[PDB]
Symmetry: C3
Subunit: 137 residues, 3 copies
């Protein structure tokens, strides 16, 4: 039991990422942009983000994995990655992984936020933003 | 067979980290600040460190995983992470993982060192320093 | 089914890395500098690169994992890591992992490229460049 998805998005538009199964290799829902877990268990979950400067912009970008229905109003992220974008090093890269208890039926969604002096200046390297997981149980 | 711990420490005081089991989810010893492995085997082991600037400080911070009783006077680290702190990007982040042969009964300890022009200026983001592992055997 | 290799190379010479089994712990071929996979399956594959400034140089360094016989003229990398080297932070570090479908008999090779204003100025920290993997199947 495992999965790996690649993000379609290259432009830095805030909100949830759209995914597609990895060509290289539970299921995805294109309508809500939500991965859904079938088997309950402890999963190793990782994601990865590359950025390329395509110009003189700066700031930071954030990925956050949110689990299904929130189950609290607090809205905590199960996984979160921050990457700073230098002003004029034309690339930036983040990797993070950890163990997660996931429930049978639990939807997963990934959100991108960018607080930058130029959201136009950088963009995601196409094919280089990946969410992967496998069951340790 | 797996585990994941979160560091209590936010202040940058040198010496061994204090841990607690992840709320999200072999055993820990609070007295010596040492995780202890029950089953022998090859484990994937990872740790993760986030830092936040809370001011104009700089330098670097280091995490090192040391295995149990040293078994040599050399004192080599099984796992080690270095993160540089820029002077006035208000955050810094390190992730590292690798495969380790671990012995039944082996204690694990994690040490933090900081060589900085202001140890007061940065601190660990609370909940964001994690040590995790699972058996590949 | 797993493996972990450490790179012999410390100097920043372009081309394929030479490896050796991890002292800490399918097979390696010293003649072609190629790891070879025995059992078919989905593997979690990771690599790691540390760099140390040993002087006033700058630029970037790249690792790329290429799979066996190319099977296309395109020559895409299954795994790729980029690390920028600041001019006068005396260290740099990259980690990346993802899930890969690997074929029985498939050779793996890792290539290092450096585009730098001084390839002489930085070098790989000895023992700190690692390629590891384990089967998720």
């Amino acid at each position: 039991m495992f999965a790996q998805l690649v993000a379609q998005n290259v432009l830095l538009i805030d909100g949830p990422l759209s995914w597609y199964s990895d060509p290289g290799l539970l299921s995805y829902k294109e309508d809500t942009k939500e991965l859904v877990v079938a088997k309950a268990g402890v999963y190793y979950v990782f994601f990865q983000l590359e950025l390329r400067r395509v110009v003189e912009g700066s700031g930071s970008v954030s990925l956050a994995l949110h689990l299904q229905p929130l189950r609290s109003a607090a809205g905590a992220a199960a996984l979160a990655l921050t990457v700073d974008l230098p002003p004029a090093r034309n690339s930036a890269f983040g990797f993070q992984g950890r163990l997660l208890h996931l429930s049978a039926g639990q939807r997963l969604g990934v959100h991108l936020h960018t607080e930058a002096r130029a959201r136009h200046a950088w963009q995601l390297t196409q094919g280089a933003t990946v969410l992967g997981l496998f069951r340790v149980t």
